[PDB]
Amino acid sequence: HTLVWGVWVNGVDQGDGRNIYIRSPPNNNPVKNLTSPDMTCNVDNRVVPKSVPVNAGDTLTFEWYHNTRDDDIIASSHHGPIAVYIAPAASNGQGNVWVKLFEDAYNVTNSTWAVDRLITAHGQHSVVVPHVAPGDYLFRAEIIALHEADSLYSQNPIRGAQFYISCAQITINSSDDSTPLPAGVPFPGAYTDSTPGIQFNIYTTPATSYVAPPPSVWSGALGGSIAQVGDASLE
Ligand SMILES: *[C@@H]1O[C@H](CO)[C@@H](O)[C@H](O)[C@H]1NC(C)=O
Ligand SMILES: [Cu+2]
């Protein structure tokens, strides 16, 4: 159970984004239904009144939290991968529009899942803004908690992969549009019960054998990292 507080740009806090530039749901409950419109931008998908200005080559940092800012971030049990997608705002996230900018699942060296490193980073993970057409965008940050993903939600609705999904309204101002955004995948639709990484047993299968759900990260991406860029406690 986790939510996005706001974003940083180039290590500068853009301020509390909840229901402002983040299309925030009312609480930190997971989405589990792979076919639900809730897979796009969670359960209260609507235009919020601000969009964060960035330029191509900027570092955009999502900051997650559990109950209060810079707390335990997400329960340690919620081992799983982290992805970031982008689509143009005109889509409202509908159709084949979502392009993957970032993927992190399991790090064999440190023996840590993306989620484990997200807690250590005080909820912060980043992408570098790509050289797409200037205009308005949705950045969709997605945590998949796998602690009940040995079951499929479609078969047993009290278990399944847990999706923590947050859409940020981002406006790209300065960009040469030298890496125009290629075709996207749909959410809902890209993840199905047979998709690699949706049904997995983290208790019996080695984490080194985990494969995250496609699509692969776009070659145009510059992303990006799970790492603290700013200290929330200084504000
Ligand atoms: C999952 O979402 C689909 C599409 O909205 C819906 O028809 C179905 O009833 C949902 N399943 C549950 C258990 O709510
Ligand atoms: Cu939870």
- Specify the CATH number for the domain of residue 21: 2.70.50.70
For residues 123 and 149, the answer to whether their CB atoms sit within 8 Å is no
- Measured at the alpha carbon of residue 101, what is the angle toward residues 205 and 7, in degrees to the nearest 5? 105
> Which residues form the pocket of ligand 1, taking CB atoms under 6 Å from any ligand atom?
33, 35-36, 157
The answer on whether 58 is annotated among ligand-binding residues is yes
Listed in order, strand segments (DSSP E) in the chain are 3-9, 12-13, 52-54, 59-65, 82-88, 99-104, 106-107, 112-113, 124-128, 135-145, 162-172, 225-226
Q: How far is the CA of 119 from the centre of ligand 2 (A)?
A: 13
- Looking at all shown ligands, the one closest to residue 153's CA atom is 1
Contact 192, 213 (CB under 8 A): no
Provide the residue range defining the domain that includes 56: 2-235
Q: Which residues contact 159 (CB under 8 A, 6 or more apart)?
A: 148, 149, 150, 151, 152, 153
Distance CA 23, CA 202 (A): 31
Phi/psi region, residue 172 (left: phi>0; alpha: psi -120 to 50; beta: rest), is: beta
Give strand pairing partners of 143.
Answer: 82, 164
Alpha-carbon radius of gyration of the chain: 16
Residue 39 and residue 61: Cα distance in Å, rounded? 21
Query: In angstroms, what is the resolution?
Result: 1.6
Give the whole-angstrom CA distance, residue 53 versus residue 82: 24
Determine whether the annotation assigns residue 128 to a binding site.
no
CA distance 155 to 225: 34
Give ∠ CA 78-67-34 in degrees, rounded to 5. Answer: 45
- CA–CA distance, 53 with 20 (Å, rounded to integer): 13
Ion ligand 2, residues whose Cβ is below 5 A away:
1
Number of domains in the chain: 1
- Residue 131 labeled ligand binder: no
**Contact (CB, 8 A) for 223 and 128:** yes
Q: Which two tokens stand for residue 18?
A: 């909840």
* Helix and strand element counts for the chain (H, E): 2, 12
Measured in angstroms, how far is the CA atom of residue 38 from the centroid of ligand 1?
10
Phi/psi zone of residue 73: left (φ > 0), alpha (ψ -120 to 50 degrees), beta? left
The three-state secondary structure class of 54 is strand
Burial class (CB in 10 A: 0-12, 13-18, 19+), 226: buried
Closest CA to 61 of 170, 176, 197, 214: 170
As given in the structure block, the two tokens for residue 219 are: 């070659």
Residue 57's nearest CA partner among 181, 217, 186, 176 is 176
Nearest to 82 by CA among 31, 116, 35: 116
Calpha distance 191→214 (Å, rounded): 8
Atom index in ligand 1 nearest the CA of residue 153 equals 13
